[PDB]
């Protein structure tokens, strides 16, 4: 995932700044934080404030950006395993100044703010709803990093991740959108690219994949060429983001000979189950079928170009987002075009959607089957 190429004559979008909550909440935030970028004058872009109870791993996570990054402790809250989100909630309000006053200055021209939290947890998901009342009474343009946690994660676990989720998509027209992570998921993937590789490399792969999912779209948007108006500008991207539900993106590379327009069954099944194996979640076809906003970008070759984006392509295109998301606002079905391309990537067409306003996925369902099978069977046995 090197984006050393594009981000020389790139540049992001929108300043994000995340808000770590939690081991895993600031684990991901520190690792979005720590990320050098080849664009103009700012390796770092993003900043971030990892708010956790002091641990020896919190007292562990290494920072490569000086200045950008704040650790804020919370003494005498050294939980550990007793995993109570109650208790992380006063921690956060006991702080809440000493927090806040550390917000007011990190993020003093962050167009957008991502409250990375890891579900499940006692810390983190605790103060997850504190954290929230405090951006919003502060009007700030906020959103929800979540992750959903591990079936092996224990009973206990879950029943915390549930709780949140629930009190989030309950209020979830309070704030920006929600994108969430199936850490279950990528779990399952890094099995399959890498099968040889180690348990004690995954969390790197996770942290330093959502980072890069996260930073490749908010990279795309601002740094190609667009083929006509329609376009998926930063201005564009700012809304989907900022529109409550959770949120969705999807990834796909094809090479030239693949896309067929005579043909488009061929690779339309595939955008159509790139577009349902989402990047950091599943998400069914009835699920998107309620999303309010929709984005379809397609980078290519200044030769590919021309020749690909004809008429029927742009509407075969506008036609697959139609019977994706039939109620979404607007289909910008807007294609760029990448003029310092690599010849070894020439015949390559790239795809890249943003599916905001969505439902809880079903993987928060299979979660509360979970917590029922043992509650149920817990009982069963007496
Ligand atoms: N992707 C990712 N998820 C994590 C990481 N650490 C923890 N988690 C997830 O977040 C959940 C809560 O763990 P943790 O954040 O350490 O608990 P907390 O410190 O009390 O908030 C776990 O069940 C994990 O699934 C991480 O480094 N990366």
Known sequence: ?????????????????????????????????????????????????????????????????????????????????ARNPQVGEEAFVKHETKIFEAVKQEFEDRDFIWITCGLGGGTGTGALLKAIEMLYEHDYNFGLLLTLPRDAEALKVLENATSRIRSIAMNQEAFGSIVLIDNAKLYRKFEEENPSALANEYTSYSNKYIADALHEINLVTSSFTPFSDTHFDASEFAQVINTPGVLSLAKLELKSNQLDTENPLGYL??????????????????????????????????????????????????????????????????????????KKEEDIVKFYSVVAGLPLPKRVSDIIDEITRIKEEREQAN
């Open 1 to 81: 995932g090197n984006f050393s190429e594009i981000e020389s004559q790139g540049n992001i979008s929108l300043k994000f700044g995340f808000l770590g909550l939690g081991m895993g909440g600031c684990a991901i935030a520190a690792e979005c934080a720590n990320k050098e970028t080849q664009i103009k004058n700012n390796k770092y872009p993003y900043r971030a404030i990892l708010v956790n109870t002091n641990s020896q791993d919190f007292n562990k996570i290494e920072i490569k950006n000086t200045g950008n990054v704040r650790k804020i402790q919370l003494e005498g809250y050294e939980q550990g395993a």
């Open 269 to 342: 099944t595939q955008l159509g189950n790139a577009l349902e194996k989402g990047v950091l979640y599943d998400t069914e076809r009835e699920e998107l079928e309620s999303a309010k906003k929709s984005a379809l970008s397609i980078v290519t070759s200044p030769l590919r170009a021309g020749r690909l984006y004809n008429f029927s392509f742009l509407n075969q295109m506008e036609n697959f987002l139609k019977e994706r998301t039939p109620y979404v606002d607007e289909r910008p079905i807007a294609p760029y075009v990448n003029k310092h391309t690599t």
